Every structure is written in C-alpha cells, then in structure tokens.
Design a protein around this motif. Structure first.
Motif, PDB file in Angstrom:
ATOM      1  N   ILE C  19       0.803  -1.231   0.000  1.00  0.00           N
ATOM      2  CA  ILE C  19       0.000   0.000   0.000  1.00  0.00           C
ATOM      3  C   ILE C  19       0.834   1.278   0.000  1.00  0.00           C
ATOM      4  N   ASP C  20       2.122   1.198   0.286  1.00  0.00           N
ATOM      5  CA  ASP C  20       3.079   2.294   0.242  1.00  0.00           C
ATOM      6  C   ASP C  20       4.463   1.714  -0.062  1.00  0.00           C
ATOM      7  N   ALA C  21       5.324   2.440  -0.765  1.00  0.00           N
ATOM      8  CA  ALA C  21       6.696   2.006  -1.017  1.00  0.00           C
ATOM      9  C   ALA C  21       7.609   3.213  -1.240  1.00  0.00           C
ATOM     10  N   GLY C  22       8.822   3.172  -0.697  1.00  0.00           N
ATOM     11  CA  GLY C  22       9.853   4.166  -0.965  1.00  0.00           C
ATOM     12  C   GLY C  22      11.080   4.023  -0.073  1.00  0.00           C
ATOM     13  N   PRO C  32      -3.103 -11.009   8.399  1.00  0.00           N
ATOM     14  CA  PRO C  32      -3.515 -11.042   9.792  1.00  0.00           C
ATOM     15  C   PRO C  32      -2.718 -12.041  10.642  1.00  0.00           C
ATOM     16  N   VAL C  34       0.759 -12.722  10.204  1.00  0.00           N
ATOM     17  CA  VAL C  34       2.217 -12.516  10.128  1.00  0.00           C
ATOM     18  C   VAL C  34       2.844 -12.312  11.502  1.00  0.00           C
TER      19      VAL C  34
END
Lengths: 112, 76, 34, 138, 112
Positions: C19-22, C32, C34
């Motif tokens: 949902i986000d990367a950088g 659920p 992990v």
C-alpha cells in the motif's frame, strides 16, 4: 474474558480487553509464542492505559515470533520474585526463576 | 458513477477564503485554478505568494502588513 | 447465547498487498497471521 | 416518514461507500450551485423528492456530514412511531440492557470492520416493537 | 487515460493515476506549464508511492507556474541520456538536451 494483542513495535505491545476486564498498572500479563525454536511463554508488564479499553505493555522476553490477535491473560498481580532464606546460593533471572537449577523458586514465598 | 463524479469535479473570477492565519502565513480554501507561486491579493490591499498547494487548501506567505488579515476574508 | 454462537459459525496461504513504497520501506495491508 | 428514513439510510450507505465523492463533497463553497449540480446529477435516479429536498441543505468534515444524514433518518422514523413513544423507548433501553450485559455480543456487533449486510442479518436474527427493531437495524 | 497533478510544494509534485495505471519508481512523467513567458514542459521523476493510486514526484525544472489538476503523461521509462562516440565535443544538461546544438543527440542510442 481474557484480552488480545492489537499492535506490536519492538519491545512495546498494545493489548485490548473486554469492557470490564481492563488490568491495573504494573500487572503481569502472559502471551504465547508458537514458532519452532522461538516457542516460549512471554511475560508482559502493563505501562499505560490508552483509553477505549486499550493497554500498552513492555515485553520481558524478546517479541520476535509474536503475532497480532494472540490471546493475553491478566495474572491479576504484579511481577513476583521468590524471597526467603533458601534464596542464598542461587542465581536468578529478573523474573525470579533459577538459572543453575530450573523451577527451584516455585515453592518459595513470592513478593511483588 | 465515478466518471460522473469526476466530470462534476472538473466543472468548477474565482474567489477563495482565508481558513487560518498567523504570524505572516495564511491558508486559503478554494482557488481550484491557482498557479504555484501565483501572487494573491487580500482585502486590506495586502499581497501573498502561494507556496504550498495542498489537496484542499493553499498555503500563502504574506507580504506587508499581515495584521490586516483574519479568518473569513475573501482572497482573489 | 444460542443465536450469537450460530451467527459466529455463519461468519492456500495468506496474501497481502503493498500500500506504500519508498527508500527501501514498504507498508503491506492484510496478513492477519504474520 | 418510513419512506424518507429508507431513502436517508440508503443515501448514507452511498456516501460511506463512495469515499472519493464523500471526501470531495465535504468541502464548503461560496454558493449552493455546485452542491445542487451533483445533487441533481446523482440523487434523481434512486431517491424521493422530500429526501432530495432535505439533502439539498456547510459541515466541518466528512464524518459529521455523513452522521447528519443518519440523525435526520432517526428523527424521521421516531416521528413515524410518535405519529407509541413509551413502547419504542422502553424496548430501546431493553436492547441496550441486552447489549451491555453481553460483552462478547456487543463486541461482535462492532461491525464497521466487517461486511455490514451480514451484520444486519445477524442482528435481525438475534433480536418486540417493530420500530425499535427498525432503529436498531438502521 | 492518464494522471493528474494533485499537490505541489516547491519542486515536489504529487500525481494521482487511475487504479491500475500507476508508474514504477524512477519513471519520467511529462507535465505542461502554459502561463506565458514562463511556459515549458516539465519532467517529473517518481520517488515514492503514497498509496490509493497516488505517487510523489521530484521536478527536474522549477515548478513555478504549475497549476493543480493538469494532465501528466507517463513515458514508461526512466530519465534517458544520449550515449555514443558522437557525444564527445558537446555540452549537455542532465536530461541529455544539448546546449551547443538544441536538436543534437535526439537520434543517438539512449541509456537509462
């Protein structure tokens, strides 16, 4: 009746409890780690109340292998240590179990 | 549905309103067609520079007497 | 009791999605277990 | 009142599901003309004239703008019961007693992080005054 | 279908794309500035993904005059420079536009 883990960040674990069951400050909670070589019972001390039945805790064993949503049981008292004469000549970890003879402290008087 | 919502959002002489002001900076709501570093004007004869253009408001630095600025003023 | 327990009854591997990367961090939604 | 409450509950469902619309309409304007522009575009196919005329009414944020639709729908349906006030109130306190006495049922009822259709089915199967049950289902 | 500019803060620009059409990291995006004497085609580089089909970009030219909502087109490749034995003799800016002869190098092999 018991709670569950909501959030984990390093040594700090947030737990959630049913509406009336919220534990006091400095209670010992338990949680279970189930993976392989890391499998142990984890003891977990209450640091804060965050509101909306959330409670924030500090882990005693490393949190590696812990998982979100695992059950957490309030022991209803603080961390306790064996005290008495027969404590002399043994080596204890922080939690009060003997490193050079496992289980040794289980039958002593325990203090908060 | 979503294409009718986007077509409507495109359909928007435009005037904005100051939603926050302090210390020599102000935030403007509206102005859906303002250029970055466009020169704004405020009702007291005061100008500003549109430095930051967020999704829903424009952050303007104020040039000259920011004492004449308050919330609910128009800007053009 | 009874109706609620029946509603709880009526309620491969796990997939998440980025949902986000950088900058070498990514945030993953789901997982659920992990 | 019952027709309008169903229109307000269903448009509230469109508003909470259409997040891109919700986050765009929850912004104040210098005139009503764009607010009526989307209202005429989207309300005409699936809603009654009274419901649209009320929805034609500035809020601080999207959460409050969504809540204000439910609040009008609750008022409407309770005015419909009043048009039985003691029986709807007593049944509604009694449902509150059942929910607060059963903390696993109250927590299982916390359905915003779940499919709301299956939640409403579960509550209607667990739950009497018809309008009190309607408010609870709303 | 193509993306839109949605935030601007100095040389950093956020751009929103359709659900499935989000560019990779380090792609070059074009955008148009059309004010007047200040008019030019910007190159943006993709630096982050912010979620919900939104990406954050770094601008290779001053953003001055860029307006919210302009269309941005994804070129599908990183910033490219002309390479070859014919590159010697000449002066280039970062984008591989020649300052000594403006049309030069357009026909050379382009590496990322």
């Amino acid at each position: 009746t018991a709670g569950r883990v909501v959030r984990i960040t390093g040594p700090v674990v947030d737990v959630e409890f049913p509406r009336g069951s919220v534990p006091e400050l400095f209670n010992a909670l338990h949680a279970e780690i189930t993976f392989g070589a890391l499998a142990k019972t984890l003891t977990l001390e209450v640091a804060q109340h965050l509101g909306d039945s959330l409670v924030r805790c500090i882990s005693m064993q490393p949190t590696d292998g812990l998982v979100r949503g695992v059950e957490v049981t309030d022991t209803g008292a603080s961390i306790s240590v064996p005290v008495g004469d027969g404590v002399k000549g043994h080596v204890f970890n922080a939690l009060g179990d003997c490193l050079d003879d496992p289980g040794y402290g289980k039958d002593f008087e325990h203090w908060s | 549905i979503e294409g009718a919502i986007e077509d409507y959002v495109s359909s928007f002489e435009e005037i904005g309103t100051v939603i926050d002001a302090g210390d020599g900076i102000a935030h403007v709501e509206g102005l859906p067609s303002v250029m970055t570093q466009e020169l704004l004007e405020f009702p007291g004869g005061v100008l500003g520079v549109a430095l930051n253009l967020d999704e829903h408001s424009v952050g303007a630095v104020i040039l000259g007497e920011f004492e004449k600025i308050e919330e609910g003023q128009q800007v053009k | 009791x009874x109706x609620x327990x029946x509603x709880x009854x009526x309620x491969r591997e796990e997939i998440g999605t980025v949902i986000d990367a950088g900058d070498g961090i990514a945030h993953v939604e789901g997982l659920p277990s992990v | 009142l019952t027709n309008l409450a169903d229109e307000l509950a269903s448009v509230a469902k469109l508003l909470l599901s259409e997040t891109a619309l919700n986050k765009h309409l929850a912004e104040p304007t210098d005139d009503s003309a764009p607010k009526v522009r989307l209202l005429e575009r989207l309300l005409s196919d699936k809603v009654s004239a009274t419901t649209l005329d009320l929805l034609r009414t500035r809020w601080s944020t999207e959460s409050n703008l969504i809540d204000a639709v439910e609040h009008t729908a609750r008022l409407a349906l309770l005015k419909r019961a009043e048009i039985e006030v003691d029986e709807v109130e007593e049944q509604l306190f009694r449902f509150g007693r059942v929910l607060d006495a059963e903390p696993r049922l109250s927590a299982l009822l916390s359905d915003y992080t779940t499919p709301a259709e299956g939640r409403v089915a579960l509550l209607d199967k667990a739950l009497v005054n018809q309008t009190a049950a309607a408010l609870l289902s709303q």
